[PDB]
Amino acid sequence: MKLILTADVDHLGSIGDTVEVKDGYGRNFLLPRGLAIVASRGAQKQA
RNA sequence: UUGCACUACGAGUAAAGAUGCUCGUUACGCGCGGCAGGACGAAAAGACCCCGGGACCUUCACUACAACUUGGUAUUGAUGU
Numbered sequence: 001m002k003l004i005l006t007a008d009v010d011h012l013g014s015i016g017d018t019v020e021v022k023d024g025y026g027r028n029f030l031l032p033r034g035l036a037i038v039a040s041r042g043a044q045k046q047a
Numbered sequence: 048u049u050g051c052a053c054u055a056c057g058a059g060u061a062a063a064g065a066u067g068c069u070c071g072u073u074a075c076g077c078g079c080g081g082c083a084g085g086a087c088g089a090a091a092a093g094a095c096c097c098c099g100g101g102a103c104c105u106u107c108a109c110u111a112c113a114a115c116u117u118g119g120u121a122u123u124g125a126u127g128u
């Protein structure tokens with residue numbers, strides 16, 4: 001699943017860049033901790 | 048229990064062991080008490096045996112299945128080597 005992240009994650013990206021991740025790292029670690037959101041409209045709220 | 052009935056015996060004969068058929072012999076009609084030789088006595092659609100069917104049991108008979116177990120894949124991520 002692809003994510004527009006909000007914090008800084010080592011080995012994954014800086015703020016705001018969209019990146020696809022292995023779908024268990026998304027819903028278990030980056031989404032409950034608030035470090036990312038989905039990529040459906042935030043690319044327009046980043047651009 | 049019961050097809051009948053004024054239901055003898057001998058030698059025969061016959062589905063090959065006869066109250067009932069042949070040839071003889073014997074026996075007045077009807078009861079009561081006893082005995083248990085026959086009526087292949089009664090009872091039980093022979094348990095034996097065989098044929099057909101069934102059931103349960105056995106196992107290195109056949110096919111399955113539970114259980115137990117093997118790997119892949121999903122749940123399932125991150126980082127070094």
Ligand SMILES: *C(=O)[C@H](CCSC)NC=O
Binds near residue numbers: 095
């Ligand atoms: C033999 O096993 C025996 C014979 C019966 S005699 C008519 N049966 C026993 O049950």
Ligand SMILES: [Mg+2]
Binds near residue numbers: 023
């Ligand atoms: Mg997945």
Ligand SMILES: [Mg+2]
Binds near residue numbers: 065
């Ligand atoms: Mg005779």
Ligand SMILES: [Mg+2]
């Ligand atoms: Mg005679």
Ligand SMILES: [Mg+2]
Binds near residue numbers: 067
């Ligand atoms: Mg006569």
Ligand SMILES: [Mg+2]
Binds near residue numbers: 074
């Ligand atoms: Mg007489």
Ligand SMILES: [Mg+2]
């Ligand atoms: Mg008498």
Ligand SMILES: [Mg+2]
């Ligand atoms: Mg007798």
Ligand SMILES: [Mg+2]
């Ligand atoms: Mg009898």
Ligand SMILES: [Mg+2]
Binds near residue numbers: 092
């Ligand atoms: Mg019989």
Ligand SMILES: [Mg+2]
């Ligand atoms: Mg397994």
Ligand SMILES: [Mg+2]
């Ligand atoms: Mg498995």
